[PDB]
Design a protein around this nucleic acid. Structure first.
Ligand SMILES: [Mg+2]
Ligand SMILES: [Mg+2]
Ligand SMILES: [Mg+2]
Ligand SMILES: [Mg+2]
Ligand SMILES: [Mg+2]
Ligand SMILES: [Mg+2]
Ligand SMILES: [Mg+2]
Lengths: 131, 185, 47, 141, 125
RNA sequence: GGUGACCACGGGUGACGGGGAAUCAGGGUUCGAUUCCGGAGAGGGAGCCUGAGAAACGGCUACCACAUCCAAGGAAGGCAGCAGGCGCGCAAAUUACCCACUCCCGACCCGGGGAGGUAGUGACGAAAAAUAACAAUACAGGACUCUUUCGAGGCCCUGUAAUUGGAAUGAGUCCACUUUAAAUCCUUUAACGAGGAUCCAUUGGAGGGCAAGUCUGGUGCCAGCAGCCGCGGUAAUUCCAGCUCCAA
């Protein structure tokens, strides 16, 4: 925080996704690649926004520390971004709850559904006894 | 199917005639007074020289006033001088034939780190390169085969992290310091 | 038959076993090449 | 001499490819009967089972009894002889063991003083041979 | 030598390489004399030979190590009759041979001293 | 009547073709099963419905060959898909995760994708690049050298060369950060982490071609080496070893 500066380039506007996309660079001369959570608040405060509609990813520092490149993602609202945002980032910072079974059990269940013919009761029952 | 490339070429070629004493002595001179690790690098720089000589040759046979000739000759001369091997006034497609391998080796960063005076005993210079201590204008580079350019010669300096520029003394510095400080109060 | 299968390991069996003498860890890689150049190639300062 | 007309490609190519049949390398390369007669079937190496250990005798300038083995292959399992290429490896090999015989080095011809043997045995039961010889790995007991 | 330090100091330019007599070869043997003076020399026809105290010190070293001449010869990689003659006293002394049997024995015969109790110090300093 | 020495026809192909690969004065010579395009096929023929589009096979029918369960009454098969088995062989990877990227499909922002991507194995192979740097310290001999030997270094060539002598670090443990669908790895970056820095480079040779031993000790036309000339029966420059050097 004492010697950590955030710079931005390729700054562009689009209410297309009611959002603004710009690639960023961070200076951390005597420390590791900085975590995202506090620099999110940094971008929020120097654009006078809340540190929650701010999304950012893809931090790859260069050789020997120093500059780290990442793509910042600012938006207009939590809900507007909620409509159009990939789910994985919404699960990184917990805002979209992600919990489903692994693909193997789902495929097995699908094969069980295609096994039982037509009737809803046996079909919906094809996961009760095949639990 | 797969999104890979499988693109790669050997940077070196072996000599065709093995166990020839004179070439052995010559390459040994080069490795000794240029501090390389193995003759693979010598062959690799020789192979680079051979490629550029082939290009220059197939230019020379091509008739002058040809726009490809002028264009690619300009590009070749400009890249070679931008590296720093050839004099700027030396501006014709022929002297590159007269050029040899030693000035190519001079562009290896392991030798300007010597020539500017910061690193004596060129082997010490190379180990300093592998030490991640030298820093190009804004970046720390650890490759003893770096080929520098004109616009890079004056911007070679120690890294701030190295215990020769900025602070953070090395680990044995800390070892000796705390060992000495532990014996008294 | 020849019977020479009896003498298959003749000289190897007979030859006495002398321990390999100890040597210091030889400098390898670039240092070894440095040693080569030092041992063979003396360079003298010109007048 | 040789015909050097303009539209004479047929004559030249027919003559050359006809005379291409007159050197040993091309003949044994493209006729195919050598490969059929090749006991390896063109393989660089092939597994083999030990059938009998047999000593052979060298040529005139030399005087020795050379150690060899009669080996049956697995595929197209004919019988041929192989050279144990070292001093004490012969005592290292038992009867009826898998071997990985290989060519001799001069392409299907006997080498040096050896009569009629074109093959060296390597890779005795899966442990290696020369590592067995130097003892880096031992027999599988 | 400081001349090498100057060669390092002469970094900008200069320096050429000149080889040596062997330059990597194995001779396993080395004639003590120059063999060019021997050509040029004509007045002297006497070889200094080896003195008997030399052979006596050799005998004492072998006894202290408990080695027959055969075993010492195996140690030095020379013929047993060589050390035999070095004991007897003719031996036409050779500096490399003497240095070898020197390193084998604990007692230092080499140099102006006849016997150093331990050659070049114990474990050589 | 058609074609044919301007090579038909027929046979062989260990031939899927091309883009391309290797080699590289030029010309040329070999390879292209294989990620792009085209074709063929889905155990082997044949015939089919539907469908705009199939002679489809992760569609159907018949025969042949395999081969599953079987209350013996019948029923169900096609991994040259992803894996992963057996066999074959000298010869070839994990029955992992994910649809986030690419694009595809469907009524459809929304589901699905062993396509595909990620990881695991991976000395196929290619790029780079560690195994140490610096500084201070010896005995011997010699063209030698200087009062003639003495003394002497004016050198050259050899020493445990450390304890040199403490600087810099990775290889590693290793906090996180980062990366990622989630990870892993890489890069950062803290804590440790090196003086036989024993944190140890090997592989093949040392007669010739072809660089390196006319060293030693065994061995005695024996064993064996040797691409090829050849070496080996007592003193082997060639085998087996110790030491030393050569090559990458
Ligand atoms: Mg075919
Ligand atoms: Mg092919
Ligand atoms: Mg295709
Ligand atoms: Mg089909
Ligand atoms: Mg069909
Ligand atoms: Mg290492
Ligand atoms: Mg030997």
């Amino acid at each position: 925080n004492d010697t950590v500066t955030i710079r931005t380039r390729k700054f562009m506007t689009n209410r297309l996704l009611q959002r603004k996309q710009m690639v960023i660079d961070v200076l951390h001369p005597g420390k590791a690649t900085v975590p995202k959570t506090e620099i999110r608040e940094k971008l929020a405060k120097m654009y006078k926004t809340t540190p929650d509609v701010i999304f950012v990813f893809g931090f790859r520092t260069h050789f020997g520390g120093g500059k780290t490149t990442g793509f910042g993602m600012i938006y207009d609202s939590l809900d507007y971004a909620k409509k159009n945002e990939p789910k994985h980032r919404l699960a990184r910072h917990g805002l979209y709850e992600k919990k489903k079974t692994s693909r193997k059990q789902r495929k097995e269940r699908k094969n069980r559904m295609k096994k039982v013919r037509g009737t809803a009761k046996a079909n919906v029952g094809a996961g009760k006894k095949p639990k | 199917p797969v999104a890979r490339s499988w693109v790669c070429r050997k940077t070196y070629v072996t000599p065709r005639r093995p166990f020839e004493k004179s070439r052995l002595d010559q390459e040994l001179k080069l490795i000794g007074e240029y501090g390389l690790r193995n003759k693979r690098e010598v062959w690799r720089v020789k192979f680079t020289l051979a490629k550029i000589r082939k290009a220059a040759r197939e230019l020379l046979t091509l008739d002058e006033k040809d726009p490809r000739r002028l264009f690619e000759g300009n590009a070749l001369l400009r890249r070679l001088v931008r590296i720093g091997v050839l004099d700027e006034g030396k501006m014709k497609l022929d002297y590159i034939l007269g050029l040899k391998i030693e000035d190519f080796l001079e562009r290896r960063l392991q030798t300007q780190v010597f020539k500017l005076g910061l690193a004596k005993s060129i082997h010490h210079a190379r180990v300093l390169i592998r030490q991640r201590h030298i820093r190009v204008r804004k970046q720390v580079v650890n490759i003893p085969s770096f080929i520098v350019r004109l616009d890079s010669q004056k911007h070679i300096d120690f890294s701030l992290r190295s215990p020769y520029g900025g602070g953070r003394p090395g680990r044995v510095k800390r070892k000796n310091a705390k060992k000495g400080q532990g014996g008294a109060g | 038959v020849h019977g020479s299968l009896a003498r298959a390991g003749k000289v190897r069996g007979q030859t006495p076993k002398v321990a390999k003498q100890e040597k210091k860890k030889k400098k390898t890689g670039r240092a070894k090449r440095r040693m080569q150049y030092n041992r063979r190639f003396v360079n003298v300062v010109p007048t | 001499g040789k015909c050097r007309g303009l539209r004479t490609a047929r004559k030249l190519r027919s003559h050359r490819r006809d005379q291409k049949w007159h050197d040993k390398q091309y003949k044994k390369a493209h006729l195919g009967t050598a490969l059929k007669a090749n006991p390896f079937g063109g393989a660089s190496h092939a597994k083999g089972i030990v059938l009998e250990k047999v000593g052979v005798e060298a040529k005139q300038p030399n005087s020795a009894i050379r150690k060899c083995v009669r080996v049956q292959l697995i595929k197209n399992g004919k019988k041929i002889t192989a050279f144990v290429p070292n001093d004490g490896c012969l005592n290292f090999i038992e009867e009826n063991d898998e071997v990985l015989v290989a060519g001799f080095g001069r392409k299907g011809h006997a080498v040096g003083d050896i009569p009629g043997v074109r093959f060296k045995v390597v890779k005795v039961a899966n442990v290696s041979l020369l590592a067995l010889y130097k003892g880096k790995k031992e027999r599988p007991r | 030598q400081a001349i090498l330090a100057a060669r390092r100091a002469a970094a900008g330019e200069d320096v050429e390489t000149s080889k040596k007599w062997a330059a990597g070869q194995n001779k396993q043997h080395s004639i003590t004399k120059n063999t060019a003076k021997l050509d040029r020399e004509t007045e002297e026809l006497h070889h200094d030979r080896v003195t008997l105290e030399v052979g006596k010190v050799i005998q004492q070293g072998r006894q202290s190590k408990g080695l027959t001449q055969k075993d010492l010869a195996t140690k030095i990689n020379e013929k047993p009759q060589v050390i035999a003659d070095y004991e007897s006293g003719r031996a036409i002394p050779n500096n490399q041979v003497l240095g070898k049997i020197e390193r084998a024995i604990g007692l230092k015969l080499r140099g102006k001293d006849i016997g150093k109790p331990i050659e070049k110090g114990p474990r050589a300093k």
